[PDB]
Design a protein around this ligand. Sequence first.
Ligand code: HEC
Ligand code: HEC
Lengths: 128, 128
Amino acid sequence: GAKIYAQCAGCHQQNGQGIPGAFPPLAGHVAEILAKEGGREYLILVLLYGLQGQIEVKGMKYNGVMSSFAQLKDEEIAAVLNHIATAWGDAKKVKGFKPFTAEEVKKLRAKKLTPQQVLAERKKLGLK
Amino acid sequence: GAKIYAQCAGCHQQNGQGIPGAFPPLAGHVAEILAKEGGREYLILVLLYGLQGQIEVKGMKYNGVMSSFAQLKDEEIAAVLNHIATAWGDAKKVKGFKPFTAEEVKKLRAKKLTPQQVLAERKKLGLK
Ligand code: HEC
Ligand code: HEC
């Protein structure tokens, strides 16, 4: 569950800062997405389905593509999330959130959505 | 050594297409870089140090960026390095063609370059 995050070095970087300019800050930014309910739903989504479509995160906008892995077993995922949700301080800031879990992960394979579909649900939540 | 290449959801893809404005295609596309006197180090630089800038993709120009695959060890890095290499029929073109002697690397591990910099070494070899 951090080893995973490691399987592809780069993208969102060992630091969570990822690498601003091309990948957004998971860095702490995961909280603000983890606050706003469903968020921990939006996140689940992302790795399973993929996301795309110009977006703004901490003002610097992005527009790129990010793939889904949706291969990693509900397990495999389930983790490399409470990992990016804690492993730079976030389970912190955010209220004692219930961690992640696999049934919830297959609970969504269902959804069987798309890179845009997915943005749509990032729309639902907004910002500031 | 291709399992590695695998750790990466999306990216240059598997059919190794990659995808306009985003990630250029290596499938096919790597016949060329090898057929120069660096094409073969460089890859290591690309891989090793990062790459940033618009460039020619047997047609398109991307403005994308490529994180550094810093983190991986030496061996692993000649693996994929031998994979994108072989995987989509490119070495099946190139002469006195060799395996990414997991050494050919510690060999070019130094320069301590940088994205634009290797963006440089690119256009040195002679491209766009
Ligand atoms: C691995 C090689 C990659 C690549 C190429 C990208 N990511 Fe991700 N990513 C994650 C989350 C939660 C988001 C959303 C952030 C938000 O909504 O504010 C992102 C988003 C992206 C984008 C932005 C999409 C766009 O519209 O342009 C891009 C380009 C992107 N990523 C690329 C989460 C993660 C991970 C967490 C488990 C992992 C691993 C990755 N991303 C990996 C990659
Ligand atoms: C996964 C983490 C990724 C992501 C997001 C990208 N790559 Fe690579 N890549 C490789 C090579 C040889 C090139 C360029 C070849 C040439 O110069 O013609 C690329 C380039 C990119 C770019 C474009 C670069 C730019 O600055 O515009 C981008 C956006 C990009 N990649 C994304 C080689 C490889 C690999 C070979 C071993 C691997 C693995 C990856 N790339 C992985 C990723």
